[PDB]
């Protein structure tokens, strides 16, 4: 018979799942009733892919999206000037976020994005997409836009890879968090999230930022917080092993940080940053 | 840190096992060897298997049995046919009732070998090699104080269960078993002593628990690997893979005490192991306790 993690997927899939989120850029404005949109690109040395990322989110800047913002961690290569030429603001994490001095990782440009960003909806793009699409923002945005008590849309993909996804975050989910297996894509890097939500919650670094700000929002706020919605169709990256491994490796400390599992530290043997609350700018388990 | 993982390598690895059959039957000094295939519809390779340990039995080998899960091919005549014993869950623990999975199996043939070392292969391989009951047993019988020995394959110049999920989950919850190149292996020899006194795992989870218990309970020095030969890694369908991973993490979080929910992938999980085999077989462990 069916258990309770899967009558709550069921009817989250129902609530909060749009498999095709098909709201109109004309209607999404008009639903912002005052709040504004940044999207921000996190960027390490992504030369060959941030313009076309930014070229399909142009079109959006003065209507839907407010600030179009690219955070580079350190390119030595022409990720900045080519993020600046196809339109987007071009921000180093040092001046962010001046009073911090960084460390690496993708979690860490998050974070400071929040310092640099003034927008009440934040988006997240990665910037070594291959094939935007001009509708991801849009979508993205919707479940914030136009359904009460959402807080975090994670963005999915149908495919025509995944590896770590289904053999290391859904599985240890399903031992620690098992409603949340309810996501088709936890580790995604397209989402988006309130600017109440994400100033609140630690950032995890580096691989664990996604999975943490999932977690971190479940713990808070639940299922009824969270939605989903369908990019399009996108093929699986294939990345070496060690980097996968590395991702999993991370993944797993994250989970283990906020579900109460110590973790010795060790990384693999080859052969959290506070709250933006307390630096810048209710779901009551007792009655 | 890499200090420990070093020493160990240098003294309980082996890359090129040099041990020969009759150096290692020189050196049994009254032990016996019992070897066990699990097998659940293996009629295509278990023949080949058994045939490659078969002339080792009445020398070096002193039982050779298969455990076969309850199949419905012909399995159990052609692991006859190539030399094997074949031995039903029922046969042998008949008043238990049989639960699946391979750990169930592993398990269960405790109570019908008599060895004091004890070796699993797995009845699905399809380019057995006959060494690998030597090299697997030469540590037992030439070292001293290993109880657990794992055999590992060179991969041309672990899949992604093991370096996705088992060495990371072992990284963060038992740091020193990374050492360990292929902890997931179904090839390995473990003696009376230690695997009679043990919990056994369910299902996926049997290899890993049994590492983590003899680390434990006696420590890295009691484990050792040695290299089996090339083997290309074996393709998976990935639900299969992730239905064993959800399996390892069950087992890895039951032996640190981690809650684990029991709720599988949209998957069989199981948390209860079975009970050392010792505690039901009293008398036959005494007998052999030596």
Same mark, same amino acid.
């Given at each position: 018979?069916?258990?309770?993690? #899967? @009558?709550?997927?069921? %009817?989250?899939?129902?609530?909060?799942?749009?498999?095709?989120?098909?709201? *109109?850029?004309?209607?999404?404005?008009?639903?912002?009733?005052?709040?504004?949109?940044?999207?921000? @690109?996190?960027?390490?040395? =992504? =030369?060959?892919? $941030?313009?076309? +990322?930014?070229?399909?989110?142009?079109?959006?800047?003065?209507?839907?999206?407010?600030?179009?913002?690219?955070?580079?961690?350190?390119?030595?290569?022409?990720?900045?000037? %080519?993020?600046?030429?196809?339109?987007?603001?071009?921000?180093?994490? =040092?001046?962010?976020?001046? =009073?911090?001095?960084?460390?690496?990782?993708?979690?860490?440009?998050?974070?400071?994005?929040?310092?640099?960003?003034?927008?009440?909806?934040?988006?997240?793009?990665?910037?070594?997409?291959?094939?935007?699409?001009?509708? &991801?923002?849009?979508?993205?945005?919707?479940?914030?836009? @136009?359904?009460?008590? +959402?807080?975090?849309?994670?963005? &999915?993909?149908?495919?025509?890879?995944?590896?770590?996804?289904?053999?290391?975050?859904?599985?240890?989910?399903?031992?620690?968090?098992?409603?949340?297996?309810?996501?088709?894509?936890?580790?995604?890097?397209?989402?988006?999230?309130?600017?109440?939500?994400?100033?609140?919650?630690?950032?995890?670094?580096?691989?664990? $930022?996604?999975?943490?700000?999932?977690?971190?929002?479940?713990?808070?706020?639940?299922?009824?917080?969270?939605?989903?919605?369908?990019?399009?169709?996108?093929?699986?990256?294939? %990345?070496?092993? *060690?980097?996968?491994?590395?991702?999993?490796?991370? $993944?797993?400390?994250?989970? &283990?940080?906020?579900?109460?599992?110590?973790?010795?530290?060790?990384?693999?043997?080859? &052969? #959290?940053?506070?709250?933006?609350?307390?630096?810048?700018?209710?779901?009551?388990?007792?009655?």
């Amino acid at each position: 018979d069916l258990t309770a993690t #899967d @009558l709550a997927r069921h %009817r989250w899939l129902t609530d909060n799942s749009w498999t095709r989120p098909t709201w *109109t850029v004309a209607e999404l404005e008009a639903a912002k009733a005052g709040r504004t949109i940044s999207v921000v @690109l996190p960027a390490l040395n =992504e =030369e060959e892919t $941030v313009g076309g +990322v930014v070229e399909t989110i142009r079109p959006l800047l003065g209507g839907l999206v407010d600030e179009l913002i690219v955070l580079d961690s350190g390119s030595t290569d022409d990720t900045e000037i %080519r993020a600046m030429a196809a339109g987007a603001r071009v921000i180093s994490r =040092e001046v962010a976020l001046p =009073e911090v001095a960084p460390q690496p990782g993708k979690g860490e440009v998050l974070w400071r994005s929040l310092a640099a960003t003034t927008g009440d909806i934040i988006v997240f793009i990665d910037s070594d997409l291959i094939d935007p699409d001009p509708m &991801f923002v849009p979508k993205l945005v919707g479940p914030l836009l @136009l359904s009460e008590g +959402v807080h975090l849309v994670k963005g &999915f993909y149908r495919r025509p890879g995944g590896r770590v996804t289904e053999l290391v975050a859904r599985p240890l989910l399903a031992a620690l968090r098992p409603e949340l297996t309810c996501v088709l894509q936890p580790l995604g890097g397209e989402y988006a999230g309130t600017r109440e939500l994400l100033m609140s919650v630690p950032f995890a670094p580096g691989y664990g $930022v996604e999975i943490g700000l999932l977690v971190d929002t479940y713990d808070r706020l639940g299922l009824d917080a969270i939605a989903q919605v369908n990019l399009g169709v996108r093929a699986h990256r294939n %990345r070496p092993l *060690t980097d996968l491994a590395a991702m999993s490796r991370q $993944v797993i400390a994250t989970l &283990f940080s906020r579900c109460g599992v110590p973790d010795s530290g060790v990384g693999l043997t080859q &052969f #959290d940053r506070p709250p933006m609350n307390t630096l810048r700018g209710h779901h009551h388990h007792h009655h």
